[PDB]
Design a protein around this nucleic acid. Structure first.
Lengths: 91, 91
RNA sequence: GGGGGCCACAGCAGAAGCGUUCACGUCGCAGCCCCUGUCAGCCAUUGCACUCCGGCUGCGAAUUCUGCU
RNA sequence: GGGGGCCACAGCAGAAGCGUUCACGUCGCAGCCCCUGUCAGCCAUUGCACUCCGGCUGCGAAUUCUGCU
C-alpha cells in the first residue's frame, strides 16, 4: 500500500507547529520535491504529520531511508498514508 | 535566623524568568511591600528566587503563610536567606 | 537577530511583489559557508545569590520585472 | 491582544515621561470585574488527517504635570 504521502508519528509533540514543518521539510526534500507538510497539535493529531511528495518514488525513498531516524531526540515511525491526501486526489 | 529576604526553592525551573517574577510578586505583596524579586535561570541558581520585603515582619508573615503552597504544580520550600540582600545591607 | 568569509556575486536608480510590524510610513529582502544573542528540544541539576555563563541537539525571515552608465 | 460591565470614573486640547517596536514616526497608556486568541505550566494522549477544538492552572503591558469650557 504505497502512495504519494508518507505518514509520520512518534514525533516530539512538545515542538511548535511551525518549527516542525520547517525541520521536517529540512530532513526530507533531499529525496524529491515536497508539496506540503501538514501538521496540527490537536488532541486527535498531536505528535504526527503528513509529508506530501511530488512523485511516489520520493515517498518510498524517504520512507525506507529515514525510518527510525532520531528527530528531536525521538524515533520516527514512518509509513504510507491510509489514503493519498486530497490534494494528490485532485492531481 | 530571620531577616528581610525570604528564599524560595523547589520552583518549576521550566518557567520563564519574567513570568516567574510576575507571578511571584502576585502571590506575595499581600503581606507587605515587596522591594525586589531576584531570579536567574543559571545552572547555579535555576529553580529558586529571592523575594525581598520592606519590613522583616512581612517576610516572617509570608514565610509561615505560604510554605508548601503549590506554585505551578510544585510545592514552595520557603526559608530565610543566609544573608540579607546587599540592597537591605545598604538600608 | 548579530559578526565574519566565499567563483558566490555587473553597478546604481525607480516600480511592483514580500518581510518586519497590532497596523500602515520610514526601513530592509539573491545564493551558499563559519561563529554567535535569542527561542526551542532532550539531558543534567533541589541548587543561598544580588555581574553574564551547564552539556548536547535544532530552528535562526523577505525577490521580481523595468531603465541608465 | 480581543469583547463586555462597574460609585470606578469631570470633558477636551497641548507638553513631557512610558508602552508597542530591531529602531524612530504615526499610534496607544487611570482603577478594579467578567469572558476570551494567543503564550506558558503540570495532566492526559502513540494518535491516518487536509475545517477550528482535550482537561485543569497561570501570565495577559504603558501616567504625569500644564491650559481651556
Amino acid at each position: 500500500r504505497p502512495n504519494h504521502t508518507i505518514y509520520i508519528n512518534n514525533l516530539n509533540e512538545k515542538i511548535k507547529k511551525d518549527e516542525l514543518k520547517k525541520s521536517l521539510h529540512a530532513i526530507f526534500s533531499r529525496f524529491g520535491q515536497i508539496l506540503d507538510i501538514l501538521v496540527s497539535r490537536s488532541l486527535k493529531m498531536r505528535g504526527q504529520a503528513f509529508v506530501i511528495f511530488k512523485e511516489v518514488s520520493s515517498a518510498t525513498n524517504a520512507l525506507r531511508s529515514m525510518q527510525g531516524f532520531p528527530f528531536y531526540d525521538k524515533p520516527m515511525r514512518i509509513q504510507y498514508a491510509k489514503t493519498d491526501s486530497d490534494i494528490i486526489a485532485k492531481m
